[PDB]
Design brief:
about 250 residues; Rossmann fold; five-stranded parallel sheet; binds adenosine-3'-5'-diphosphate; binds ligand OAQ
Length: about 250
């Protein structure tokens, strides 16, 4: 159809948790809107200076006048982006809805056991898993320290609305997953919500957003734990991102 001039502001709020296809969705939204989408990748590879701001925001966000100060920081962080996905943003979906009243909301979901397994390989390995040491070695190469891991934990706790959380307990996480997804579908008006199951592809997304399907471009399939294992190993081998970045065309 016709080309229209789209506003550069948050148009889509994705409430889906990490390891539910948020990076493919990030890529898909950038393909559609030709402007950046927020993601943890954005923080890691472009705005590491944002880490302390999100930490500060989450610190303050257990609390009107205080709220507008929070909302204004949210707005600042997201300036120039057309959508949000993944931690740390997904836990703020209700506030993002107030701040951007004309934004639509997405929920990415998948089989809960697949989600947990993926989360253990990439985001939250058990502390006694030898792989955790490899993840940490690789993360140092990227310039990520304990503050980054703190942001991940605090933003997970914030999304799950838990004051603390036994990260090593699979049953706890599985139940938090189910409750989170459930709560989203109860909070957001069905008029304003689309639930995307992994594998659903362009069609239901583009219909929701009133856009044509990108011509000839397949719906992204990136950020598998196998690919992330390969990246970790390469990072440890070459000791830099820029030495290997050409081998991971997604980034
Ligand atoms: N188009 C697609 N179809 C099926 N699975 C997809 C997909 N895009 C991403 N995924 C899966 O979504 C997960 C990544 O999610 P996220 O980007 O939120 O971290 C990965 O799961 P696995 O680790 O099980 O392979 C990846 O395989
Ligand atoms: C060793 C190296 C490969 N680590 C980099 C990866 C990149 C993907 C990723 C994604 C998330 C959430 O999307 C989190 N997270 O919020 O913890 C951590 C990481 N870490």
């Amino acid at each position: 159809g016709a080309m229209i001039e789209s506003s550069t502001t948050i148009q889509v709020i994705s409430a889906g948790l990490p390891r539910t296809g948020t990076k493919s969705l990030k890529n898909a939204l950038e393909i559609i809107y030709h402007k950046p989408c927020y993601h943890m990748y954005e923080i890691i590879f472009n705005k590491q200076s944002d880490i302390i701001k999100w930490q500060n925001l989450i610190h303050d966000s257990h609390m009107t006048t205080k709220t507008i100060a929070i909302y204004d920081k949210l707005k600042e962080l997201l300036d120039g982006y057309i959508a949000t996905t993944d931690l740390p943003t997904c836990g703020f979906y209700k506030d993002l809805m107030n701040i951007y009243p004309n934004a639509k909301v997405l929920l990415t979901i998948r089989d809960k056991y697949d989600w947990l397994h993926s989360l253990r390989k990439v985001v939250l390995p058990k502390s006694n898993d030898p792989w955790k040491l490899k993840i940490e070695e690789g993360d140092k190469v990227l310039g990520l320290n304990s503050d980054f891991y703190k942001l991940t934990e605090d933003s997970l706790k914030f999304a799950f609305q838990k004051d603390d959380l036994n990260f090593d307990d699979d049953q706890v996480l599985l139940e938090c997953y189910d409750e989170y997804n459930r709560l989203v579908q109860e909070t957001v008006p069905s008029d304003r919500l689309l639930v995307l199951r992994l594998g659903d592809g362009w069609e239901p997304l583009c219909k929701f957003l009133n856009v044509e399907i990108p011509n000839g471009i397949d719906y992204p399939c990136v950020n598998s734990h196998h690919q992330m294992t390969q990246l970790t190993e390469q990072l440890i081998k070459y000791k830099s991102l820029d030495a290997i970045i050409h081998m991971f065309p997604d980034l």
